[PDB]
Design a protein around this ligand. Structure first.
Ligand code: NA
Lengths: 274, 265
């Protein structure tokens, strides 16, 4: 009536809801990585890299990939950063299998970061677009790479790497049918990682899109996004509700619900909009 | 009645879409020919400097961005190694060169290409894209336009355009106003495009062999294979169908398949 104050409150409830969902995803990720990092089939492959042991290991990772769905790759890299084992998974089809396409990944920052981790420490590099030989993969694939150095008798043997597939995950989590909000994902430095609007994505990397930065678009609301854990602002052309979460990597990840005046107007609505 | 009225509207829609594919084929023929006879390809072949490579890649990138339907434009040498490769991504509109250049000599489209005359434009049947023999995911069915390029009657290699069947079907196969979803079925009986991803490519993906029009509608398939535009209603599904030749010589079948529940608007 009264609609801005009440939409805001709805949107904050949705952000709390969704942050709890990413929290749970994070927990699953830690569990899977830890089981994979300690499996006998991995240790067998490390001791004796036979075609047979490799097959057992790939078969396990493919099963896990089909079961869990959020990993578009699962890899073992050696101490030099060269891929030794590689499973790819495609969520549209549900197909998982091995690849013989194996690259030197040592120039990548996520590898350089993985090296700094303790043996068996599970962490992640910020969300970043996938690449092949330094070239962007298309369609564009933002990924959160789970990194775990693997040791035998406390000697480091390589790195387990899981590419969690941020497009898939935002599709799964960021639209809420009942409350009908589209949550967008905004990086620690203001660029878009996920949105129903594909054109605003990845301004830090695609040069034509450098102007799609929350601080540029909202240059007075941005400081609150950075500082506060959650709040909202009404401009009043847009209602913006925001929150931050830690999603595996140490970088804050911002959750944004951004509604035009026109979208705020429709929200005198009914449950036949199911 | 209803099934019969819906049948006629489907047939109108199929002839509409047939005409769109006909027009697309004409575009393709004309662009391919222009590219095969271009100054910039000519200059690069005669003198493959990086300056000439740059000029060519820039040309092919702007053609990709202009035309939208090619997901790659390549030059392969006579031994089937890629020398020039432009990728295009229609969702972003981004086109650009790749340095990921492969030996494509084991591929059937390449062996087919080798069989063509100099300056002849033909096409290989629709086939999923691969990287070192491994399927590209997301799965990408492609219609490859092939043209051997020569100077002084000596073959220099092959211009290859990857026409991006997923893009094309998402563009042409749904019409909001009649509200029909046209599926593409291969001469094979296997599905090439459909709103239902899970039935696609039953010749290639294991565990999808049962998704063959001949298997699903054994007594309707002969009508489709005959290449005639018509329909059949089996009391549970109405199928309307027509066939076109889209660049290659093989017939491609356009299918509107509606269940009783869909029908039943
Ligand atoms: Na790379």
């Amino acid at each position: 009536a009264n609609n801005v104050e009440n939409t805001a409150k709805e949107a904050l409830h949705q952000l709390a809801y969704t942050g709890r969902e990413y929290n749970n995803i994070q927990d699953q990720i830690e569990t899977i990585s830890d089981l994979l990092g300690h499996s006998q089939s991995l240790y067998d492959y490390l001791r004796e890299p036979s075609k047979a042991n490799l097959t057992i290991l790939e078969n396990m990772w493919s099963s896990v990939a089909r079961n869990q769905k959020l990993y578009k790759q699962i890899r073992f890299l050696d101490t030099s950063g060269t891929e030794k084992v590689r499973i790819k998974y495609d969520f549209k089809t549900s197909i998982a299998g091995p690849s013989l396409i194996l690259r030197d990944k040592s120039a990548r920052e996520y590898f350089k970061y993985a090296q700094s981790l303790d043996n068996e420490q599970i962490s992640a590099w910020g969300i970043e677009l996938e690449r092949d030989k330094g070239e962007l993969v298309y369609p564009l694939s933002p990924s959160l790479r789970i990194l775990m150095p693997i040791s035998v008798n406390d000697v480091r043997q390589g790195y387990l790497v899981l590419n969690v597939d941020i497009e898939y995950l935002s599709s799964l989590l960021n639209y809420s049918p009942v409350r009908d909000f589209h949550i967008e994902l905004v990086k620690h430095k203001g660029f878009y990682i996920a949105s129903p609007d594909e054109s605003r994505l990845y301004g830090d990397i695609i040069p034509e899109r450098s102007q799609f930065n929350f601080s540029n678009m909202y240059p007075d609301i941005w400081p609150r996004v950075v500082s506060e854990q959650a709040g909202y602002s009404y401009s009043g052309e847009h209602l913006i509700a925001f929150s931050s979460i830690k999603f595996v990597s140490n970088e804050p990840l911002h959750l944004i619900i951004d509604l035009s005046n026109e979208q705020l107007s429709k929200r005198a609505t009914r449950d036949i909009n199911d």
